[PDB]
Amino acid sequence: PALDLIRPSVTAMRVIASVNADFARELKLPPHIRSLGLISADSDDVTYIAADEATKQAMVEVVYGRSLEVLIMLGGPNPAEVRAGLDAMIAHIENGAAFQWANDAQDTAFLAHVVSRTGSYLSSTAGITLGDPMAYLVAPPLEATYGIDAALKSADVQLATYVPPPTNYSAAFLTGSQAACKAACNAFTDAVLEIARNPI
Amino acid sequence: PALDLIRPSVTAMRVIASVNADFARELKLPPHIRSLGLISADSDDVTYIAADEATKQAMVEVVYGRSLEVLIMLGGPNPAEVRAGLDAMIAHIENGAAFQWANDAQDTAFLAHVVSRTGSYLSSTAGITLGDPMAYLVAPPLEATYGIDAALKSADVQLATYVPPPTNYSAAFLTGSQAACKAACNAFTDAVLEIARNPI
Amino acid sequence: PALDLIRPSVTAMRVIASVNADFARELKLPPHIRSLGLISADSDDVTYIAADEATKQAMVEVVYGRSLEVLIMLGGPNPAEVRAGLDAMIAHIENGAAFQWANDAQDTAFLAHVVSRTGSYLSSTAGITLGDPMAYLVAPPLEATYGIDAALKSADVQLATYVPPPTNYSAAFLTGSQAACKAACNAFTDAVLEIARNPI
Ligand SMILES: [Zn+2]
Ligand SMILES: [Zn+2]
């Protein structure tokens, strides 16, 4: 209704304890990576954030990950490090960051979370130092653009990465400090809400 | 009765997460191998084929394996790679290659499977390139010899390894292509069946 | 009553598959150690002996461990080696070495076990060769001192480590042979029992 979460979910899972010679290659795989985790899920950005958050709890890395709703192949040395990694992705997936509705009619959904310590997945899919804070904002395009601008007019932050909307949602990440990351966040959600009630 | 499978089974299992200094030695163990998998089973050849098939799914290798009905000690770096290995052996053991009866009286049992991509266990217990196809034929001695010959007179194949029968069954492996590996296979089973009905 | 065991127990557990950069450091952690096991328990000495006994079953080592009743952080390369390690600590904890009562009134408790092959935890918290036998004697202070002396007057053994009592119990370790380790052990328990009935 208001800002009620949207529990995302895990739809499939499977570990490949020892990726083929020929697969690791075509796949373009560091030598050190012979184990593999396949995770899929519904929300992309909420998985993106998991992939990230499991790059900190197991020595793993996101070999891959795009919107289908998703797929994230987590790479690691032995399986036991990609397990803990997957088992974490789930955990940050089944109960962590979540979209939210922006109207009551439940038909215009947004996403304002703060990543306080980027693991290696977004530090990198966004010109950043590993760990720097971040504001991951996802909303419908138009609802999106207007909200960033606001975002920005709200805190000393910068666009930390930005090809625009053309997810069928605009997403964007803003760094700066981390409180400022938060206000910006707040202000993103208000923007997007004034429009979902009355702009749109 | 006819060619009804003979489900083999797993009788025991145990991982040794960290083999003794002194055991690894007497055992003649590569340094890289400190974990160990003990598997036992009934059918030998069907385990042999598992040992093989788990050498492809976990970075493991068959440190050992002979007919007792069996024992296969799988070697690996950490345990988590010998687990996935054992868990696979089982899987290819509880539901994969299987002996079959050759008479109806259920008392003369054979084994004709095709290993399309040898892992490192048989490529090696048979002058071969790693992965080359293969025809693993097991049958009572006499039923055995007559059937190979046939085997051979059936497809362009070669004996890829062969000390003869003297398992209480003759076994033998034939390489060549892989279709030819199959006909040879077919022709092995017919041979062995004409005798189990009427030669024997 | 007499010498009835005192089952110790495991109160908490948790694996940290990938210890922080900054934690491993402050913690003073070999590079090779990125996985971590936290175990806690009631009896200290009985955990001490586990920590030890799991240093032999998984490639792990006791990064830490003191009396609180306890905490033992087990260090290892991947998690799969610290798991097997923890799972062993438990096993030698839930069913192995155990305190015992020394009176019937159940209020003066002792501990006489023989560690026949020290792993790396005590070989080292006691000038010893890795594996040398050992006699780990824990008893109330006074009950303690009198009993060692006896200990010693009983077998050719040596104090293998000794800051005295000031556990709220004196503990001490005696090496020598391993039978002699045992008599010494026996004689420690009698001593401590003559006093728990009548000295004390
Ligand atoms: Zn594991
Ligand atoms: Zn948030």
Ligand SMILES: [Zn+2]
């Ligand atoms: Zn595992």
Ligand SMILES: [Zn+2]
């Ligand atoms: Zn077959």
Ligand SMILES: [Zn+2]
């Ligand atoms: Zn494991």
Ligand SMILES: [Zn+2]
């Ligand atoms: Zn004892």
